[PDB]
């Protein structure tokens, strides 16, 4: 029952953008004519006649489904299968059940798209703000009702005499290939529309000497790769000479066949649509690139190596790029599961927003058990360095160093206190994670799906049971390709090789995900790490990142660095650093559908892997977790939709200015691809100094690395550490190892910790409403200058999520930057200094300042007028981990100067993920706040959308720019008292000794502080006279 659909697989190898050319037309079919095929529910069918562009007398018939997916959010969907019947996926971002839920709801509200065919056979329908006509050859024209402006239309190619063929729908003749494609008109060079293409996940793009946000005029591919430094040599163009730089035509770790189009930007007629081709074979997005004749300036396309063809167009409910992102998250939502909290993504435990240090190259938990080796370091020493210098420090990412000789799910004796492996909870022999708990830390460990196979007698229960229950990927293929064999076997198993450099390597077996039982089995292994204290998950080598291998060499032998190349191609022998593309893996896209060669679904392996860890690991064994029941996953690769499993770090970056640039750009682009909780390794993972690899990050690059990343969602300093036993990496990178910059380093980490609720609320808003935490400058509407500023300017936070403006310095040894403040609003310079001094005057939005001064101790960060920001301090004044905070450590609602005599605020509150009752039982609180001025009276109002988590400690209002009132009155459900001046005269005295109902005139920071009881938080009217 392998290969149910009778497909002949024509390509297995990596076909770069340079070899993908649907606009060529040769051997390609495109829609030439149709007749109507009925409408059931909201899915129309058109019976489309496809014609070979370069000889239209050759024609085939395939039905194409046209389904409206949301009336209120203006999204519909084209879908056909060139190779067989149209099939609903059973795994992926877009599920039928969620589409059904959305439709059923909008139908109950009497939404009517009025899908109809005309006399002529043209399908017409309408969404809320748009109307669509699709002609005979499937020519498509999408119009916005309010101004009658055509916002999107697909491409038509002419023939000699056979009429116009719609490249809106294309597939390669199956006598010659398997590729699909879809082409639109591209208005990038229109004088008025100036169309720009955004999104596309982790892709990097250089312009002159700089890494930029926009993705216009370039040819990209998704092909999840083990792409160290984002510029792997085998990923080079044909006949490329000299250094390969990271750039647009190089795949990354995450697969985002997703672009958001933006035209007429910063004007009253702005339009925005998202474009999603839902395919997990190698996929392409060309946004008007003439290089290698892969595209044409005036066309834009998407395509893939394999079928099926299934594509979403998503315009959003209303104005602006951001609205495209939230509508997209809804098609991917879990509303049909009745998720009270996790609608658009899964909420992490709060601790995920803390500062982590990871290291590849620790050799024990405690010093007393650290083996001798040049530059060896213990987990304990890192903890000390951070803790003793009073860093706000959350915990560790313990690498494969911890494992027993690379046996995933195991530990070795050195990573325990008593130097032997225990089964857990013995107060006389604590695991790394347990010991880490007592320091008030939480931990991830590295988990790959590489199940070591060369075991030299030594028993490994995980690889063993996989063999026994036949849950491994078999060594079958439709080509008779010999994947290699060892003396360990099994005979019919795919045996890959894991290689970490410097002779640290092993043979592996892998989970055949598509099988029943594999996910359950996978997930039940995590029991072995949860019961010894493991907090969350660091998913890695996800492709799987297998050692480069050429068919016909021993499993442990990799090819010459230079192979394959254009003169000496792969010709079906290279494994492109994962499974050899021909291996028959059990279908991951369609359950109980059979086996298919991996080439078909490369870009879904990591998704599935994350999926299984989240549902069979983290959720099913939630009981085996120790200190915190909720958990998370930081994954290296995945697909669109991966946000219901957890977040991402952007694999192996390096330690240069360019990589700071890229980090910010990846973060912005990843967010808008519906993956909010993402970030890059702070300081850069790999070595950078070509004369000596062990040279650590400089202090000025680390400062700027820290400052750019300090408000991004995932904040982990991680690096490859040179040790004697693994001789690649840098000497160190930990923040405390930078004595000259230590004070700045630490204060920017404090600053983040004070604004932990700003992060957390932003994440709630993402889980409930799909808003991206990080906003591109171009998401700010009615500004025609944010576009030029979009490489390094980004926003977040507050009630709307556009209250904080960041513009980090992105070059080393630099103390100026060109600053642009978004127009029609005011900004206030802020940062780690400003907690303890008054604000400077207001800065006028719409300002361009060249050479804006940014000394090293500073980053550019502004809080908008009308912002009220939930802010947290420690009661005792010392820096501690977020995960050891209680409600007694103050909440403070910082009221910034009023905008239009108004300010606004939002705080999500829950236990932090100690339990799972916020996402399971709706046990959480949303507090909102407002401030208004009206002559001599200011009114501060607390309301709740719901109050199901009880904030057990006193909270504060910090009014900036106010001093001594004549009276403050508080009104509340069970309270109505006038406030009295506190006999405390310092913030520290107010926190610890101040009375519920005290106020304090802070002259030092020009703020008035109200201390209020915990029970007035869900509802209050505070009036300042
Ligand atoms: O597992 C070792 C190593 N693998 C590659 C990952 O990107 C890196 O973060 C990790 O340290
Ligand atoms: Cl990966």
Domains contained in the chain, CATH given: 1-318 (2.60.40.1760), 319-806 (no CATH), 807-877 (2.60.40.1180), 878-1025 (2.60.40.1180)
- Reference 792, options 202, 214, 203, 193; nearest CA is 214
List the resolution, Å: 2.3
Is 926:764 a contact under the CB 8 Å cutoff? yes
Is 968:1023 a contact under the CB 8 Å cutoff? yes
Whether residue 400 has its Cβ less than 6 Å from ligand 1: yes
Q: Indicate if the alpha-carbon torsion angle 364, 365, 369, 370 is positive or negative.
A: positive
Is 993:875 a contact under the CB 8 Å cutoff? no
- Reference 129, options 316, 324, 330, 320; nearest CA is 316
From the alpha carbon of 500, which atom of ligand 1 is closest?
A: 2
C-alpha 446 to ligand 1 mean position (Å): 8
Name the token pair of 986. 């310092």
Residue 110's φ and ψ, nearest 5 degrees, are 60, 30
Whether residue 540 has its Cβ less than 6 Å from ligand 1: yes
Angle, alpha carbons 525-526-528 (nearest 5°): 75
Structure determined by? X-ray
Is 20:294 a contact under the CB 8 Å cutoff? yes
Whether residue 399 has its Cβ less than 6 Å from ligand 1: yes
- Rounded Cα distance, 262 and 270, in Å: 7
Query: HEC profile for 404-456?
Result: ECCECCCCCHHHECCCCCCCCCCCCCCEHHHHHHHCCCEEEEEECCCEECCCC
For every residue of 702-713, DSSP letters joined together read HHHHHHHHTTSS
- Rounded Cα distance, 627 and 747, in Å: 28
- Rounded Cα distance, 38 and 912, in Å: 51
Whether residue 636 has its Cβ less than 6 Å from ligand 1: yes
- Reference 316, options 117, 128, 572, 487; nearest CA is 128
Name the token pair of 805. 């403006």
Q: How far apart are the first and last CA of the chain?
A: 79
Residue 204's φ and ψ, nearest 5 degrees, are -105, 145
Name the β-bridge partners of 584.
597
C-alpha 745 to ligand 1 mean position (Å): 24
Residues in CB range of 801: below 8 A, 6 or more apart: 762, 765, 771, 772, 773, 775, 795
Q: Indicate if the alpha-carbon torsion angle 414, 419, 422, 425 is positive or negative.
A: negative
How many residues are recorded in the chain? 1025
From the alpha carbon of 720, which atom of ligand 1 is closest?
A: 11
Pocket test for ligand 1, best of 446, 543, 578 (most atoms within 8 A of CB): 446
Q: Omega into 544 within 30° of 0, i.e. cis?
A: yes
Q: Omega into 307 within 30° of 0, i.e. cis?
A: no
- Reference 649, options 566, 507, 540; nearest CA is 540
- Reference 216, options 194, 241, 239; nearest CA is 194
Residue 918's φ and ψ, nearest 5 degrees, are -75, -45
C-alpha 604 to ligand 2 mean position (Å): 11
- Rounded Cα distance, 222 and 284, in Å: 6
Is 1003:963 a contact under the CB 8 Å cutoff? yes
C-alpha 764 to ligand 1 mean position (Å): 29
Residue with tokens 């951001």: 322
C-alpha 331 to ligand 2 mean position (Å): 26
C-alpha 634 to ligand 2 mean position (Å): 11
C-alpha 578 to ligand 2 mean position (Å): 10
For every residue of 311-364, DSSP letters joined together read EEEE--SSSSHHHHHHHHHHHT--GGGT-SS-SSSPPPPGGGGS-EEEEB-EEE
- Reference 778, options 286, 271, 363; nearest CA is 271
Q: CB burial class (10 A; 0-12, 13-18, 19+) of residue 258?
A: buried
Whether residue 651 has its Cβ less than 6 Å from ligand 1: yes
Is 770:317 a contact under the CB 8 Å cutoff? no
Rama region for 521: left / alpha / beta (φ>0; ψ in -120 to 50; rest): alpha
Is 422:413 a contact under the CB 8 Å cutoff? no
- Rounded Cα distance, 135 and 546, in Å: 48
Is 889:882 a contact under the CB 8 Å cutoff? no
Name the token pair of 56. 């239209």
C-alpha 351 to ligand 1 mean position (Å): 21
C-alpha 255 to ligand 2 mean position (Å): 11
From the alpha carbon of 651, which atom of ligand 1 is closest?
A: 7
- Which residue's alpha carbon is at the smallest distance from atom 10 of ligand 1? 360
Name the β-bridge partners of 867.
904
C-alpha 540 to ligand 1 mean position (Å): 7
- Which residue's alpha carbon is at the smallest distance from atom 11 of ligand 1? 360
CA Rg value for the chain: 29
Whether residue 652 has its Cβ less than 6 Å from ligand 1: yes
Task: Report which bound ligand comes closest to the CA of 546.
Answer: 2
Residues in CB range of 962: below 8 A, 6 or more apart: 938, 1007, 1008, 1024
From the alpha carbon of 448, which atom of ligand 1 is closest?
A: 1
Whether residue 681 has its Cβ less than 6 Å from ligand 1: no
Residue with tokens 């080598």: 541
CB-CB neighbours of 81 under 10 Å? 19
Residue 708's φ and ψ, nearest 5 degrees, are -70, -40
Angle, alpha carbons 459-465-469 (nearest 5°): 155
Buried b (16+ CB within 10 A) or exposed e, 168-184: bbbbbbbeebbbbbbbb
C-alpha 593 to ligand 2 mean position (Å): 26
Q: Omega into 750 within 30° of 0, i.e. cis?
A: no
Pocket test for ligand 1, best of 225, 399, 681 (most atoms within 8 A of CB): 399
**C-alpha dist (Å) from residue 934 to 865, 901, 963, 1019:** 17, 7, 17, 21
- Which residue's alpha carbon is at the smallest distance from atom 3 of ligand 1? 360
C-alpha 686 to ligand 1 mean position (Å): 10
Is 599:581 a contact under the CB 8 Å cutoff? yes
Whether residue 885 has its Cβ less than 6 Å from ligand 1: no
Residues in CB range of 745: below 8 A, 6 or more apart: 391, 702, 703, 706, 735, 738
Q: Indicate if the alpha-carbon torsion angle 729, 735, 736, 741 is positive or negative.
A: positive
- Reference 502, options 727, 238, 173, 736; nearest CA is 727
Is 935:973 a contact under the CB 8 Å cutoff? no
CB-CB neighbours of 978 under 10 Å? 9
Task: Report which bound ligand comes closest to the CA of 408.
Answer: 1
Is 259:271 a contact under the CB 8 Å cutoff? no
Residue with tokens 């007698």: 457
Pocket test for ligand 1, best of 232, 542, 648, 685 (most atoms within 8 A of CB): 685
- Rounded Cα distance, 790 and 779, in Å: 10
Is 17:292 a contact under the CB 8 Å cutoff? yes
Name the token pair of 904. 């606004």
- Rounded Cα distance, 28 and 60, in Å: 12
Angle, alpha carbons 332-336-339 (nearest 5°): 90
Angle, alpha carbons 973-979-984 (nearest 5°): 130
Is 904:925 a contact under the CB 8 Å cutoff? no
From the alpha carbon of 636, which atom of ligand 1 is closest?
A: 7
Q: CB burial class (10 A; 0-12, 13-18, 19+) of residue 625?
A: buried
Q: Omega into 118 within 30° of 0, i.e. cis?
A: no
- Rounded Cα distance, 1024 and 427, in Å: 54
Residues in CB range of 739: below 8 A, 6 or more apart: none
C-alpha 803 to ligand 2 mean position (Å): 34
Residues in CB range of 66: below 8 A, 6 or more apart: 43, 44, 45, 46, 76, 77, 78, 115, 123, 125, 134
| 987: enclosing H helix or E strand | helix 987-993
Residue with tokens 């080439």: 599
C-alpha 543 to ligand 2 mean position (Å): 5
- Rounded Cα distance, 648 and 253, in Å: 10
Name the token pair of 497. 């090789």
Task: Report which bound ligand comes closest to the CA of 542.
Answer: 2
- Rounded Cα distance, 516 and 492, in Å: 19
Residue with tokens 């893939």: 304
Whether residue 360 has its Cβ less than 6 Å from ligand 1: yes
From the alpha carbon of 360, which atom of ligand 1 is closest?
A: 11
Pocket test for ligand 1, best of 652, 654, 716 (most atoms within 8 A of CB): 652
The one-character DSSP state at 70 is E
- Rounded Cα distance, 757 and 763, in Å: 9
- Reference 267, options 212, 194, 167; nearest CA is 194
């Amino acid at each position: 029952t392998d290969n149910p659909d009778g497909i002949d697989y024509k390509t297995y190898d990596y076909v770069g953008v340079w070899g993908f050319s649907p606009l060529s037309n040769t051997n390609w079919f495109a829609a030439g004519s149709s007749t109507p095929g009925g409408i059931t529910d909201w899915t129309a069918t058109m019976n489309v006649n496809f014609d070979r562009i370069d000889n239209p007398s050759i024609t085939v018939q395939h039905p194409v489904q046209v389904q409206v997916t949301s009336y209120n959010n203006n999204s519909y969907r084209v879908r056909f299968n060139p190779d067989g019947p149209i099939r609903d996926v059973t795994r992926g971002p877009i599920l039928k059940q969620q589409l059904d839920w959305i439709r059923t709801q909008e139908l109950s509200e009497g939404c009517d798209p009025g899908m109809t065919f005309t006399s002529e056979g043209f399908l017409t329908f309408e969404t809320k703000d748009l109307s669509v006509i699709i002609y005979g050859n499937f020519k498509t024209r999408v119009t916005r009702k309010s101004d009658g402006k055509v916002i999107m239309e697909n491409d038509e190619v002419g023939t000699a005499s056979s009429g116009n063929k719609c490249r809106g729908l294309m597939f390669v003749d199956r006598l010659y290939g398997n590729a699909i494609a879809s082409v639109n008109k591209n208005f990038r060079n229109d004088a008025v529309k100036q169309e720009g293409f955004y999104g596309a996940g982790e892709v990097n793009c250089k312009y002159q000497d700089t890494y930029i946000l926009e993705r216009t005029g370039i040819a990209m591919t998704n092909y999840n790769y083990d792409n160290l430094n984002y510029n792997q040599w085998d990923l080079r163009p044909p006949h490329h000479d000299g250094a390969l730089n990271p750039d647009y035509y190089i795949p990354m770790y995450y697969a985002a066949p997703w672009l958001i189009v933006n035209g007429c930007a910063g004007t009253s007629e702005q339009y925005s649509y998202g474009w999603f081709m839902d395919n997990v074979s190698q996929s392409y997005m060309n946004t008007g690139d003439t290089t290698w004749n892969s595209g044409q300036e005036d066309l834009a396309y998407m395509g893939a190596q394999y079928g099926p063809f299934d594509q979403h167009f998503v315009y959003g409910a209303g104005g602006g790029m951001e609205c495209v992102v939230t509508a997209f998250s809804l098609l991917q939502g879990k509303e049909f599961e009745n998720q009270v909290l996790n609608k658009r993504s899964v909420m992490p435990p709060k601790y995920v927003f803390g500062f982590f240090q990871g290291v590849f190259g620790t050799s024990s938990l405690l010093r007393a058990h650290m083996p001798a080796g040049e530059n060896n370091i213990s987990v304990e020493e890192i903890v000390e360095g951070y803790q003793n210098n009073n860093f706000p420090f959350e915990g560790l990412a313990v690498d494969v160093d911890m494992q027993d000789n690379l046996r995933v799910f195991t530990t070795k004796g050195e990573f325990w206190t008593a130097n032997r492996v225990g089964t857990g909870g013995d107060p006389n022999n604590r695991s790394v994670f347990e010991w880490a708990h007592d320091k008030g830390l939480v931990c991830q460990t590295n988990i790959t799906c590489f199940l070591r196979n060369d075991n030299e007698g030594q028993d490994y229960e995980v690889n063993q049971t996989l063999r026994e229950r036949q849950l491994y990927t078999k060594n079958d293929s439709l080509t008779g390709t010999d994947f290699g064999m060892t003396d360990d076997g099994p005979s019919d198993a795919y045996i890959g090789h894991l290689d970490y450099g410097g002779g640290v390597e092993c043979d592996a077996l892998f989970p055949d995900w598509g099988r029943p039982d594999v996910a359950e089995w996978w997930g039940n292994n995590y029991k072995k790490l949860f019961s010894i204290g493991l907090d969350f998950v660091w998913q890695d080598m996800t492709v799987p990142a297998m050692m480069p291998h050429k068919i016909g060499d021993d499993i442990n032998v990799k090819p010459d660095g230079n192979w394959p190349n254009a003169d000496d191609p792969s010709n079906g022998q290279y494994n492109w650093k994962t499974y050899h593309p021909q291996v028959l893996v059990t279908d991951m896209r369609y359950e109980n559908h059979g086996r298919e060669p991996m080439v078909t679904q490369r870009n879904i392996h990591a998704y599935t892997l994350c999926e299984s860890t989240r549902k069979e690991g983290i959720v099913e064994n939630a009981d085996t977790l120790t200190k915190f029941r909720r958990s998370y996953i930081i994954s290296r690769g995945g697909y669109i939709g991966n946000q219901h499993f957890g977040g991402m770090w952007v694999g192996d970056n390096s330690t240069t200015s360019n990589y700071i640039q890229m980090m910010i750009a990846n973060n912005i682009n990843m967010n808008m691809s519906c993956l909010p909780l993402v970030g890059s390794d702070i300081g850069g993972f790999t070595s950078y100094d070509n004369e000596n690899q062990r040279t650590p990050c400089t202090g000025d690059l680390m400062v700027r690395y820290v400052q750019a990343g300090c408000l991004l969602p995932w904040f982990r300093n991680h690096y490859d550490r040179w040790i004697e036993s693994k001789d690649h990496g840098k000497d160190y990178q930990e923040l405390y190892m930078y004595p000259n910059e230590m004070d700045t380093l630490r204060k920017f980490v404090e600053f983040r910790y004070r604004w932990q609720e700003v992060l957390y609320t932003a994440m709630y808003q993402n889980a409930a409403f799909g808003k991206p935490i990080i906003k591109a400058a171009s998401m700010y509407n009615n500004d025609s200058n944010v576009r030029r500023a979009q490489n390094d300017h980004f926003l977040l936070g507050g009630h709307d999520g556009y209250r904080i403006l960041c513009a980090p310095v992105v070059w080393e040894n630099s103390t100026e930057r060109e600053l642009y403040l978004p127009v029609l609003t005011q900004w206030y310079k802020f940062g780690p200094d400003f907690d303890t001094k008054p604000l400077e005057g207001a800065m006028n939005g719409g300002d361009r300042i060249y050479n804006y001064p940014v000394p090293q101790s500073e980053s550019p960060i502004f809080v908008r007028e009308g912002a009220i920001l939930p802010t947290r301090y420690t009661l005792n004044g010392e820096n501690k981990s977020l995960n050891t905070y209680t409600d007694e450590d103050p909440l403070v609602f910082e009221v910034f100067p009023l905008g239009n005599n108004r300010a606004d605020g939002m705080c999500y509150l829950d236990d932090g993920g100690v339990t799972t009752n916020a996402e399971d039982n709706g046990k959480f609180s949303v507090v909102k706040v407002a401030a208004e001025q009206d002559g001599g009276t200011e009114t501060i109002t607390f309301t709740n959308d719901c109050y199901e988590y009880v904030f057990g400690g006193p909270f504060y209002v910090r009014v900036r720019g106010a001093q001594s009132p004549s009276n403050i009155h508080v009104s509340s459900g069970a309270g109505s008292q006038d406030m009295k001046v506190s006999s405390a005269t310092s913030r520290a005295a107010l926190f610890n000794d101040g009375e519920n109902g005290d106020f304090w005139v802070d002259q030092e920071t020009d703020s008035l502080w109200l201390k209020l009881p915990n029970v007035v938080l869900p509802d209050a009217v505070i009036t300042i006279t």
